[PDB]
Amino acid sequence: QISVRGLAGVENVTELKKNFNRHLHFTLVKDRNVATPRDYYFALAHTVRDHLVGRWIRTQQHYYEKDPKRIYYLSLEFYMGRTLQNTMVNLALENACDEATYQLGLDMEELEEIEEDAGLGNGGLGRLAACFLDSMATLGLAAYGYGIRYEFGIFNQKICGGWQMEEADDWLRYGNPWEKARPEFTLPVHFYGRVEHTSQGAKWVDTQVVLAMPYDTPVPGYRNNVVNTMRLWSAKAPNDFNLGYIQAVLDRNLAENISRVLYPNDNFFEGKELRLKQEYFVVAATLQDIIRRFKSSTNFDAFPDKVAIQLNDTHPSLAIPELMRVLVDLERLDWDKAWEVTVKTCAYTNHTVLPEALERWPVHLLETLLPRHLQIIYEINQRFLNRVAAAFPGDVDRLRRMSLVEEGAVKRINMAHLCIAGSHAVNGVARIHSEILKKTIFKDFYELEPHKFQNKTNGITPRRWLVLCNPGLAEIIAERIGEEYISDLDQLRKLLSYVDDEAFIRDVAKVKQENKLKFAAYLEREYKVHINPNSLFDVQVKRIHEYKRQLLNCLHVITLYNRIKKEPNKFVVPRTVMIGGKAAPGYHMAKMIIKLITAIGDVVNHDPVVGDRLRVIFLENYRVSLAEKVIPAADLSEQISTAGTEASGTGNMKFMLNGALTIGTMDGANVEMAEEAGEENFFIFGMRVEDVDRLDQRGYNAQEYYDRIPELRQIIEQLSSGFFSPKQPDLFKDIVNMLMHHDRFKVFADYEEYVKCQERVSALYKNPREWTRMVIRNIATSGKFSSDRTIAQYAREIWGVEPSRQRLPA
Amino acid sequence: QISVRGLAGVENVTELKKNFNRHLHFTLVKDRNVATPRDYYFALAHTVRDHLVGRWIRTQQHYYEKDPKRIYYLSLEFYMGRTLQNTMVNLALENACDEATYQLGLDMEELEEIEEDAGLGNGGLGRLAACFLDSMATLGLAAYGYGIRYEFGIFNQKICGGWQMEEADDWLRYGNPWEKARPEFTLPVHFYGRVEHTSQGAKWVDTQVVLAMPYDTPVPGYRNNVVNTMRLWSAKAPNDFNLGYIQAVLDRNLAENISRVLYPNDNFFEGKELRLKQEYFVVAATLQDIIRRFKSSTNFDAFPDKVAIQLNDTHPSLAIPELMRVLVDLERLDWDKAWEVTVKTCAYTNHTVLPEALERWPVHLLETLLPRHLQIIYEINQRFLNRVAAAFPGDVDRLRRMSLVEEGAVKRINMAHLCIAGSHAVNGVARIHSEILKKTIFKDFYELEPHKFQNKTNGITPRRWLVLCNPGLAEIIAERIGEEYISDLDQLRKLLSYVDDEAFIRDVAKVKQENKLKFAAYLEREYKVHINPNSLFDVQVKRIHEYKRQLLNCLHVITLYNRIKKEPNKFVVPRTVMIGGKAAPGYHMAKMIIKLITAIGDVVNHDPVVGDRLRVIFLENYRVSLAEKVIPAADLSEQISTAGTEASGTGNMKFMLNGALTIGTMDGANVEMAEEAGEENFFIFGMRVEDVDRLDQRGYNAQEYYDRIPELRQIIEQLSSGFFSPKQPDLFKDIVNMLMHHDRFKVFADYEEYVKCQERVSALYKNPREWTRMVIRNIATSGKFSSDRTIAQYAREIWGVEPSRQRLPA
Numbered sequence A, B: 001q002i003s004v005r006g007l008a009g010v011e012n013v014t015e016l017k018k019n020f021n022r023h024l025h026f027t028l029v030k031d032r033n034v035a036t037p038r039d040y041y042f043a044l045a046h047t048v049r050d051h052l053v054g055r056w057i058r059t060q061q062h063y064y065e066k067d068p069k070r071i072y073y074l075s076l077e078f079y080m081g082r083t084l085q086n087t088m089v090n091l092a093l094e095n096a097c098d099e100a101t102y103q104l105g106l107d108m109e110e111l112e113e114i115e116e117d118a119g120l121g122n123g124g125l126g127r128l129a130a131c132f133l134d135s136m137a138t139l140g141l142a143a144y145g146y147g148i149r150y151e152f153g154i155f156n157q158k159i160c161g162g163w164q165m166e167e168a169d170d171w172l173r174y175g176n177p178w179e180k181a182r183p184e185f186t187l188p189v190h191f192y193g194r195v196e197h198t199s200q201g202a203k204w205v206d207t208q209v210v211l212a213m214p215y216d217t218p219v220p221g222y223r224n225n226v227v228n229t230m231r232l233w234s235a236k237a238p239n240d241f242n243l244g245y246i247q248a249v250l251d252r253n254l255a256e257n258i259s260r261v262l263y264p265n266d267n268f269f270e271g272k273e274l275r276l277k278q279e280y281f282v283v284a285a286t287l288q289d290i291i292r293r294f295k296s297s298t299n300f301d302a303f304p305d306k307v308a309i310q311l312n313d314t315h316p317s318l319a320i321p322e323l324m325r326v327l328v329d330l331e332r333l334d335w336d337k338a339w340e341v342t343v344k345t346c347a348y349t350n351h352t353v354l355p356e357a358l359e360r361w362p363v364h365l366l367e368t369l370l371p372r373h374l375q376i377i378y379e380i381n382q383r384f385l386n387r388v389a390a391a392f393p394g395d396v397d398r399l400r401r402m403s404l405v406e407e408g409a410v411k412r413i414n415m416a417h418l419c420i421a422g423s424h425a426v427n428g429v430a431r432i433h434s435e436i437l438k439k440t441i442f443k444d445f446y447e448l449e450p451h452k453f454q455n456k457t458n459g460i461t462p463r464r465w466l467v468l469c470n471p472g473l474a475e476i477i478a479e480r481i482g483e484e485y486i487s488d489l490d491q492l493r494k495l496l497s498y499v500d501d502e503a504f505i506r507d508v509a510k511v512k513q514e515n516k517l518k519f520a521a522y523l524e525r526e527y528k529v530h531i532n533p534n535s536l537f538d539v540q541v542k543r544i545h546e547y548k549r550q551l552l553n554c555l556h557v558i559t560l561y562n563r564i565k566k567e568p569n570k571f572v573v574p575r576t577v578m579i580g581g582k583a584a585p586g587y588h589m590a591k592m593i594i595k596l597i598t599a600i601g602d603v604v605n606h607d608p609v610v611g612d613r614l615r616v617i618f619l620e621n622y623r624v625s626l627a628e629k630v631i632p633a634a635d636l637s638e639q640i641s642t643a644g645t646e647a648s649g650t651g652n653m654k655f656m657l658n659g660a661l662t663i664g665t666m667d668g669a670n671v672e673m674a675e676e677a678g679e680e681n682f683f684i685f686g687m688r689v690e691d692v693d694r695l696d697q698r699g700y701n702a703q704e705y706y707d708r709i710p711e712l713r714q715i716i717e718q719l720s721s722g723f724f725s726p727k728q729p730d731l732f733k734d735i736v737n738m739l740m741h742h743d744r745f746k747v748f749a750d751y752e753e754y755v756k757c758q759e760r761v762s763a764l765y766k767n768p769r770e771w772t773r774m775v776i777r778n779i780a781t782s783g784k785f786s787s788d789r790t791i792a793q794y795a796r797e798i799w800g801v802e803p804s805r806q807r808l809p810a
């Protein structure tokens, strides 16, 4: 059909069809008379994975021969989504497979919808990991993702009576065709025990063993024939484990629990033992692998020339004391040399602002679980604090603040402090966030080692997030400027010369309208609800969090509702307001916000006076595959975090790329997005970071806003009085009480400027042509936010390797 | 190489080779430079399973079109062993694959040794199930095996310091290439709840749901293109299960524990809840499947014309009340009609003599776990006892003895009683055992319903147990009489006309000698121990059990040792005595016997005066694949159970087929074996059943034997005094004490006649030609003990179906 989806050669289609029927028969053991859509999807998945195999083997072979420096991306989360379409895009098979399946009487789009998301992440951090792998493979880097193969990913969200219920994400039930088990590369991991000191140094003994079994998933680069590896570890009990008989076998589950389930907290630290086990497990098994591969090229001076280990937040911070443990206790390097090697090898990305998201592990946990690592951490602290004392003599307070050990009723290790000390590079994930790291939470560290601190602004892969999810927009762009932009997104600037082309204006608005029609129909088919597709699609999708201020949005929505009721016969620009996102199961307030959203919907969507002028939709089970559908359909992107709380954001970027205007605070990458597009082409409102700091000094009194803003007071009274909860009048008292007395995120402070700015959005939408010209200005300046740019900067400025766009042979 | 292994056509070999390299690449994702023997085995396994696929699909298709009566073999155990060689034998691929692998530079025999046993059974009962499936497929019956896919089969046995240690049998670690998951045919199974009575009848409510997910394994018939199915169920938690969050997900393991582990007791009932859950789980899920298939051909009169359900002992006895529950409560048939259908559908094979092996479930367990089933069982009992009262009026004692409910401190359901009442046929597994069922434990039932009681003497499949394990013997037989005997084993009688052929005598003894050489070398390679292969191979392999009297054998062994020491310079026929078998983990006495065996070995095998004249070897980890090696290597088969305790035995048959003479009691199928071969051609010793009964009436006094037999007294004194345990003098006091005061199996009573009969064995072995002529007489009359004969009798006399030897099209 469309050009960026590749060729459908007659040989190619014929071959795909015969291999599809071979797999249906031999692999699935079905005949065509009993197959279901699910079988057809599996037959297709196996057919496509076949084209990965040669490329994967030759790639891994090439890395063994050339021996380049190897990048290890350690993360506890990889939010991969579906693999089938991405594989077809990256191998230029999409049209051929479409054609092949079409001649077998099947609709490929319908088979694609059968694939489960690999939901091994919570949101932004996990998804960044996934975009990174894609960009690492596309830029020909010898890169490996390492993590945990959780049996259960992020829970499936049901809404029952307007409340979130959680169900186990049994993503492996039907099998994962994209993974290859490698039980032959199974490795031991140790826990508990104790430390013996000898003449020949320290010895970690009487440990419990858990086995780590790797599953490899291929990561195809974009049309370069590169296929990198994502290796995920699974926990298995040793066979002499606990070894009356029956109970011993059943207790194997205690060890295997380590890889059972993803912790579902977004920007929240929960200090549980099982989580610490998860962190050590991926670190211990990964480092053994790294070292094994290094030794197949007794001398570790070259280690940092052959190995970069990137830590995705502090979650794998134990890689630092583990690398030391291996080098000092097993390889018998002296401390100072081992440490040099460790620092030159490791680099730490911070993804975190909020104090309650910083990992601070109680010492008694580390003492029991990882006794040698705690000895090593203490030794790191002492040597580190000795350098602080020498540089800042007499500054005893600095010593207290910089210590890796926090004093308290419970002593804790500050894993962030461990990462800065133990890494040659520390970066944040957007310019304003990297500035905040230097000015506030890591000021002291910055003053000691200024050279370590960098910025690497985040990005998203334009393969999944343009070509894949929005083929029609990719196409009209490729019509004017060619295909090359897909791996070089800066080329979208060339679209600025089409900003006054009537035909391009028509095509951009046409694609948007088709995306809306298609998403609206998706809502009817799968969830029986009727949206006006000529309305403005106002969408806020991201995890449910106080700092992301879904509640500010709710206040806007209720304001529009009250304005319509006061003046029912006045014209207003119609909106479909859609909010979606999961709340962490233990976050009471996030769960209340979801409930308020659905409660608002029940009032607004059933008011006859409102008509189709205002609709409020809670989008259930927000995940990667739903993002691929709703983001191309959106007109307005809501990026409305309180200034200084969103480290970067990446949703923001996905929307800019996909033809929606942004309403947002000067937070995270919003700042850079506005700077790229021009402030005139962005709906910026509200407090800056500096304003928030001024408000904090004089004290945030929410009451002042309630007293001065009648529209706002009206809303608080409706919430309190049970306008939105007739049967439980007091349902939302916790929301009111928090907004009035304990709002860390200053929702009321931004309320007035948000409502005003929302009016400017409405006014522009009234003028389709100028709306669309502004969209073009956004798409055309979104180049910077390619994860290819991000990864090239990581490669050049941290890892010391040169990216490449040159294809391996096919 | 040899003829019964099929053709190696040039097309066929070329094709096998290319498919082996395709699977190595595409399936295993390896290149030839990094593959290990294990990869090669997997590539071969996938290549061979490919030839099963067409046959499996067409077979299952044919059964849907022809709609024959369907046989359901329900068992908690299927002791399958390895699948690769059996598949090749049954598809006539063995020589082609040999040739294909040979030209790739690989040794197929070495790849075969990499396959794990599927050890989903304890011994005889499980293995009979496996032989049955093979014979059902070979005889073209529309037959299905149903059971549980245990994650852990029978434990691996290590000997440490002469003691059994158990390790978890992680048979699935590397994947099972022979199974196909069918998660799409997942079915619910209910537990707990309670019963509500309504107007519309009884309702089972508030249940816990466990899902049953089927895995299908193909069962190829012998060269007929039939491929039947073995369907094994796995337990999965529903996704709303237990649904803080983390703990709920971890507790899914409670439900999945149902299919986690095989209970490792041989002829012993252990009344645990988890075992009862296993029994209901396979029954509930299987019956849903049976019924679904029946309904795709509201009227159940035809059900018994379209369905036979065979119960492998009482383990799936709940099929009877479950079938009633479905017919009465869900299908709303009246009781009497449902019952008729149930009786005509079900048939019960008893495998059990020993009182401690009979299943008697406490009522309080059934009350909690399966409340409706208990109501139904009680209703069955009442109606059954009403028929007893009418037939035997006034015989109140008979009522007590025949009740399904046993009265006691704890009330119990006698599952055997439930099976007789609820089945149209009840059979034992050898003539003498079926006679004992009619004369003692089920006398009362026999007098009520004489027509229900049958004999079906056991058998073994000559494919695994001759062709596969002993190709050289198969070949010399095929040289004289052709190939047809492999599916018609009665044709071995034709070998009687070769009993005085010098060339045949030479070939039979040659094959035996080659098997011994090969087994001896296997002992050196894998277990570093040096056996004289010119010695007589005296072997007793079977589970460790007091009733099987390994201890009698030990007494013989110690007697030979003491005779050598008394008269060191006298000639004796050299022996290698090998005993192997697992003990149940909780069976203290079985574990002591193993220890005594190794203790005897430590004395005898290190005595310089003994030389290579006597060796005692404990064969570690006895299992199906070890049986395939040692049974062809044996000269003397030890079948020495106390008369009346071995229901049948099947080891006995495997040895007769493979060219060993039998020393045995008139127990089990030993009686029929002797009758077939002639008593002159068998080493029969010891008490008959009648003798044991006489001894029981007057009282078994072990002391009398100890006082009258000096040789025996000497042995008891050595055991007591620590001759065999120098560092722990009293180690074996529990063995002595049991033999002297509490021997249920009357070891001393058979001692004298056993030693005498062992002397006759030694004397015959001194005359190779006459030894071998006797072997020929044994092999030649072993036809009856084919499981093809057994299954044909089940088909004709119980299931009402006609077997067939006609091939499906290829």
Ligand SMILES: O=C1NC(c2ccc3ccccc3c2)=N[C@@]12O[C@H](CO)[C@@H](O)[C@H](O)[C@H]2O
Pocket (backbone or CB within 6 Å): A122, A123, A124, A125, A126, A128, A265, A266, A267, A268, A269, A313, A351, A352, A357, A429, A458, A646, A647, A648, A649, A650, A668
């Ligand atoms: O989406 C994100 N999640 C986390 C984060 C931080 C700490 C955690 C601790 C425990 C568990 C999960 C955690 C997740 N940080 C985020 O990283 C994205 C990628 O840089 C940024 O775009 C987001 O602004 C930022 O919020």
Ligand SMILES: O=C1NC(c2ccc3ccccc3c2)=N[C@@]12O[C@H](CO)[C@@H](O)[C@H](O)[C@H]2O
Pocket (backbone or CB within 6 Å): A049, A050, A052, A053, A177, A178, A179, A180, A181, A217, A218, B026, B027, B028, B029, B042, B174, B175, B176, B177
């Ligand atoms: O389950 C399996 N997955 C793959 C496989 C093959 C190629 C791939 C290419 C790309 C990504 C994933 C891939 C996975 N091979 C399989 O290995 C199992 C263990 O060896 C076998 O039991 C399966 O029959 C076989 O199908």
Ligand SMILES: O=C1NC(c2ccc3ccccc3c2)=N[C@@]12O[C@H](CO)[C@@H](O)[C@H](O)[C@H]2O
Pocket (backbone or CB within 6 Å): B122, B123, B124, B125, B126, B128, B265, B266, B267, B268, B269, B313, B351, B352, B357, B429, B458, B646, B647, B648, B649, B650, B668
């Ligand atoms: O090998 C056998 N195991 C059992 C058996 C009986 C009751 C059980 C109860 C619980 C668990 C396992 C059990 C096993 N019976 C046997 O069946 C074989 C097949 O008919 C016979 O040849 C054996 O003589 C007989 O001993």
Ligand SMILES: O=C1NC(c2ccc3ccccc3c2)=N[C@@]12O[C@H](CO)[C@@H](O)[C@H](O)[C@H]2O
Pocket (backbone or CB within 6 Å): A026, A027, A028, A029, A042, A174, A175, A176, A177, B049, B050, B052, B053, B177, B178, B179, B180, B181, B217, B218
């Ligand atoms: O793991 C698998 N086993 C088989 C399979 C195919 C043919 C067979 C023929 C006979 C016996 C067993 C058989 C098993 N197919 C597989 O199904 C998985 C689930 O659909 C896929 O993920 C695997 O990639 C694929 O290899």
Ligand SMILES: *Cc1c(COP(=O)(O)O)cnc(C)c1O
Pocket (backbone or CB within 6 Å): A122, A123, A124, A127, A541, A542, A543, A622, A623, A624, A627, A648, A649, A650, A651, A652, A654
């Ligand atoms: C990109 C993405 C996120 C991160 O979005 P933010 O708006 O930056 O919080 C979260 N979840 C999913 C499913 C995504 O695709």
Ligand SMILES: *Cc1c(COP(=O)(O)O)cnc(C)c1O
Pocket (backbone or CB within 6 Å): B122, B123, B124, B127, B541, B542, B543, B622, B623, B624, B627, B648, B649, B650, B651, B652, B654
């Ligand atoms: C045949 C067989 C048995 C049964 O042997 P008996 O001597 O009848 O107890 C037990 N275990 C294995 C491995 C077998 O192959």
